[PDB]
Amino acid sequence: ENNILREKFENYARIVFQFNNSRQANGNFDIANEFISILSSANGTRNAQLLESWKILESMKSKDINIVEVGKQYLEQQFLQYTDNLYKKNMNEGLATNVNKIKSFIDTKLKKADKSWKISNLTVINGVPIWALIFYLLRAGLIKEALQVLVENKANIKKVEQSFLTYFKAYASSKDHGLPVEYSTKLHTEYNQHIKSSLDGDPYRLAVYKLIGRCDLSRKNIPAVTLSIEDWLWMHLMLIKEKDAENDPVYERYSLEDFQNIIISYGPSRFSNYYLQTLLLSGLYGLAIDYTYTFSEMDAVHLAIGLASLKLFKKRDIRFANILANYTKSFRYSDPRVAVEYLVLITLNEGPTDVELCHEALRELVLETKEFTVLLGKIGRDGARIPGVIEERQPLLHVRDEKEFLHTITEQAARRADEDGRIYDSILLYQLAEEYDIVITLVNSLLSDTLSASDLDQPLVGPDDNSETNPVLLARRMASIYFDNAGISRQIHVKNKEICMLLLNISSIRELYFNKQWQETLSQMELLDLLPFSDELSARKKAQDFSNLDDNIVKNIPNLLIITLSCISNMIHILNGQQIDSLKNVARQCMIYAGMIQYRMPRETYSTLINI
Numbered sequence: 001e002n003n004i005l006r007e008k009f010e011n012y013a014r015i016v017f018q019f020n021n022s023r024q025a026n027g028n029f030d031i032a033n034e035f036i037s038i039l040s041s042a043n044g045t046r047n048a049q050l051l052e053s054w055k056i057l058e059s060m061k062s063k064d065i066n067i068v069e070v071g072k073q074y075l076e077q078q079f080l081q082y083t084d085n086l087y088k089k090n091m092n093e094g095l096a097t098n099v100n101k102i103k104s105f106i107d108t109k110l111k112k113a114d115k116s117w118k119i120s121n122l123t124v125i126n127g128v129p130i131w132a133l134i135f136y137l138l139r140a141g142l143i144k145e146a147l148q149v150l151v152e153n154k155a156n157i158k159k160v161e162q163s164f165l166t167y168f169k170a171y172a173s174s175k176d177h178g179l180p181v182e183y184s185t186k187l188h189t190e191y192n193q194h195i196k197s198s199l200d201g202d203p204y205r206l207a208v209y210k211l212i213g214r215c216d217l218s219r220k221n222i223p224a225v226t227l228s229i230e231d232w233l234w235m236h237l238m239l240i241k242e243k244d245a246e247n248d249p250v251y252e253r254y255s256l257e258d259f260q261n262i263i264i265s266y267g268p269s270r271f272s273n274y275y276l277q278t279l280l281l282s283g284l285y286g287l288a289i290d291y292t293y294t295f296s297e298m299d300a301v302h303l304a305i306g307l308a309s310l311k312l313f314k315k316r317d318i319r320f321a322n323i324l325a326n327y328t329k330s331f332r333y334s335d336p337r338v339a340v341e342y343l344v345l346i347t348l349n350e351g352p353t354d355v356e357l358c359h360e361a362l363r364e365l366v367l368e369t370k371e372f373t374v375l376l377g378k379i380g381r382d383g384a385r386i387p388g389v390i391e392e393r394q395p396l397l398h399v400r401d402e403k404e405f406l407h408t409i410t411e412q413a414a415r416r417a418d419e420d421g422r423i424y425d426s427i428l429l430y431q432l433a434e435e436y437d438i439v440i441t442l443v444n445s446l447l448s449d450t451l452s453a454s455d456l457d458q459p460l461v462g463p464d465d466n467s468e469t470n471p472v473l474l475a476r477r478m479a480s481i482y483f484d485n486a487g488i489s490r491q492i493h494v495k496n497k498e499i500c501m502l503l504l505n506i507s508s509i510r511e512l513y514f515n516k517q518w519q520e521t522l523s524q525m526e527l528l529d530l531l532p533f534s535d536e537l538s539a540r541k542k543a544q545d546f547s548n549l550d551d552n553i554v555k556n557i558p559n560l561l562i563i564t565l566s567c568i569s570n571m572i573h574i575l576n577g578q579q580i581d582s583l584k585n586v587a588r589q590c591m592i593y594a595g596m597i598q599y600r601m602p603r604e605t606y607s608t609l610i611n612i
Contacts, residue, residue, distance in 0.1 A: 005298070009331070011038060012302055013338045019305075020341055024395055031309055032058030035302065046295055049276055050303075053288075056280045057306045065310075067283035068240050068256055074281065075234040076141035083140060099145055102136050103128060119224055123202045125156050131204035135225065138208065139234065147172050159194065163187065164209065171212050177243055184213070191215045211238045217254050220262075229274045233281060236262070260284055286318050301327045301342075308348040321346050321357040328365070336371040340389045344396045355398050362390060362397075363409050367416060372425065376410060377432055380481045382488075385432060407433060427474070436482055436491045440500055443478050447471045447503045448552040451510070452559060460511055472507045479504060499552050502528065506556060509563065518567035522586070525564050530557070532589040539589040543596050558602050561594050565610050587611060 015034045022029030032054050039051040056074060063070050080098075086109055087101045094100050106129060111117055122129040130153050137146035150157070150165050157165070167187050171178030178184075187209075195201065195209050196216060203224040209215055210222060220239065226232050236259050245253040260282050268275040268291065279288035285307055292300040293315040300315075304323045307313060313320050324342050332339040343365060346358035366375050377385035385391065391406065399405050414429035416422075423446055430438045450471050458472065459465055468474045479500055482488045489497075505528060513521045525531060530553070532538035546554070568587045572580050594607055 008298065012298060013335075013341065016302075016305070016345070017338075017341050020344060020393065020396060024393070030058070030061075031306055032061065035306070045273055046299075049273055050292075050299055053276045053280055053292075053303065054306065056277060057303070057310065060310060066242070068237055068242055071281040071283070072234065072237045073141065075230050075237070076139065078230065079136075079234075080140040080142075083136075098140070098142050099133070099137070099149065102133060102140065102142075106132050106136060119203060121200055121202050122204070125153060129202075129204065130156070131202045131208060132225075135204040135207050138211070139231075143172050143176070161190075163190065164212075168212055175243070177241055178212075179244060179248075187213050188215060207235075211235065214239060214241060214252060214254070217252050220254075229271065229278075233278060237281075256283060285312050289323070290316065290318060297327065297330075305345055305348070308345065313349055320349055321354065321361065325361050328361075332365060332369050336365065336369050336374050337389045339365055339369075340375065340393060344393050347396055347398050350398065358397065359399075359405060363412070366390075366409055366413055370422075370425070372413065372428055372432075376406070376413075376429075380431065382481070382485055424469070424474075428468075436488050437493055437496060439478060440482070440492050440496045443471075443475050444496065444499045444503060444552050447475045447500075447507075448555060451503060451506055452555045455510075455514070458507075458510060460515075472504075475500065475504055475507070495550075499550055502530075502553060503556075506560070513563050513567070518571045521563060521567050522571070522583075525560065528560070531560055531564060532593050533586050534589070536589060536592060539592040540596065542593050546597055546600070554600075557597070558604065561590055562604075562607050562610065564590055565607050569610055 015031070015038075018034075019029055019031055021027070035054045036051065036058060039047055039054060042048075042051075059074050059077070060070050063073075083101050083105050087096070087104050091108065092100070092104060107127075111119060111122075111129065111132065117129070119132075123131060130149060134146045134149050137143070137149065147169055150168055154162065154165065164187065167178070167183065170180060191209055191213060195206060198206070203222065207222045207225050217239065220236070222235060226235060240254050240256055240259055242256065245255065263271075263278060263282055263284070264287075271278050276288060276291055279285075279291055289300050289304045289307070292303055297315070301323055304313075304320060308320050317323070317326070324346055328339045328342055340362070343358060343361045346354055346361060362375075366372070369375075373388065375388045375390050377388040377391060379386055390397075391403075394403070394406075397405070410429055410433050414426055414433060417426040417429055423442060427439055427442050427446070430442065466473065468477055479497075482492065483497060483500075505524065509521050509524045509528075512524075526533045530542070532542045546557070549557075565587050568583055568590075572583050574580075591607065591611060594601070594605055598605055
């Protein structure tokens with residue numbers, strides 16, 4: 001049955017809900033730390049890949065984001081860290097400078113296996129492969145100190161390559177896209193002629209030349225010193241020239257676009273366990289979420305949330321609104337509240353279109369899940385609404401509609417209720433719409449029908465059909481919470497309140513018709529001022545008065561007659577000062593009345609069968 005997801009569904013929903021809290025409370029909640037947090041706990045390839053991808057996202061937090069430069073930095077920081085952690089594991093004599101940490105990685109980590117180098121050709125001075133040292137310093141972001149190391153080993157370097165030293169300083173002193181309008185041409189010929197085609201050349205020397213010079217953009221690999229997938233990626237990022245590339249009319253330009261295309265030509269299988277990261281680092285955000293769909297929709301959705309919260313976005317539909325709405329399909333009916341929490345991240349992408357898309361998604365959620373009381377509120381006892389979940393998320397809707405929206409969706413729901421004949425829904429909806437007169441007029445209909453019929457029913461005190469799920473109990477609710485409230489009550493027509501009280505009265509008479517108490521029902525029927533209890537002049541005045549009667553009551557008279565003749569018969573059960581003469585006169589005038597109205601009345605002067 002998988003509690004395993006549902007648990008996972010709920011943990012992720014929790015994090016989003018706290019995100020929405022902070023957005024609303026103007027806090028600093030960090031979504032990426034929160035996934036990093038959960039994911040670090042979990043095991044497996046995908047999880048420990050999801051985890052690294054969230055670390056990628058979170059180190060772009062508040063960088064200005066130039067894709068090439070932040071991918072480079074993450075790769076560089078990653079390696080430095082790895083380097084510090086090796087050193088921060090015992091051994092060393094000297095001071096803990098960056099250089100010495102790298103000298104340690106070179107010497108101690110795997111350039112050796114028992115004092116002999118596991119990469120051939122290295123030029124070594126005083127126990128140090130100085131080109132490898134320059135390479136790895138560069139690899140960790142430490143360009144100035146890489147430059148220091150080349151400068152310091154001047155007298156030891158040569159085949160007159162005191163020249164590269166010049167170009168390196170310059171590449172370091174600019175914005176690392178070291179473009180002298182001059183030399184770069186000169187360093188390219190020296191590479192082609194003395195460096196490129198060696199056999200006994202230090203492979204790290206070639207690497208350093210290549211990268212610093214952007215030297216030979218075919219042959220995009222470094223023969224013996226790309227040791228890892230992130231090494232591979234870093235190198236590629238070093239070789240791109242973004243700024244002022246379309247300037248200088250030479251096709252030694254190599255773009256992010258080119259790079260992105262190479263990755264695609266290889267596919268996931270060539271990046272096993274590193275593909276998501278590769279997509280994220282190369283700026284293929286779309287393809288990155290696309291790829292993460294192939295193993296979990298939940299993960300794709302949330303990574304997309306991460307990307308969206310980083311102002312990016314500018315199983316195959318990859319727009320933010322649709323990623324969220326689609327996710328929601330899996331649980332809107334079971335968890336409408338959670339659906340709201342997701343639909344409200346649409347506004348992460350600030351700006352119209354998106355805002356409207358959010359509004360349309362909510363609107364669509366409400367219609368069709370029909371979860372009105374969760375989504376749109378409830379009740380009264382005055383105290384306006386008790387807000388629904390949408391209302392609680394008001395500020396995240398970027399609406400500042402005077403709650404126009406929310407009242408406009410309620411009118412829409414309500415009129416759909418009217419076409420489906422989902423009365424109850426309509427009454428609920430017009431309560432929220434504050435259409436008090438419409439509410440009462442709908443309540444009168446529903447109560448009217450259902451008072452006119454045939455008996456056995458109603459429940460009074462005990463269980464079975466409770467409040468605002470059955471017509472009388474609901475009519476009692478409305479009268480109580482509206483009629484005594486001046487401000488609400490003035491908004492409802494006197495006529496409409498009169499009909500309401502009439503129908504409620506008839507219900508009181510039903511409660512205490514059977515339940516014994518035949519005397520008490522006659523009294524109340526009489527008070528209704530509807531049936532003749534006096535003389536024959538009143539039975540025909542109840543006819544003049546009968547065709548002026550509102551359509552709601554003109555339909556209830558049937559059973560009013562016949563509850564009257566019934567008490568009037570259970571009571572005058574010819575007994576064992578006994579005025580039976582009235583209680584009998586009453587039946588008379590009632591039968592004269594039911595004689596003159598009858599073709600205006602269903603199909604039953606079977607008042608005769610209880611008359612005699």
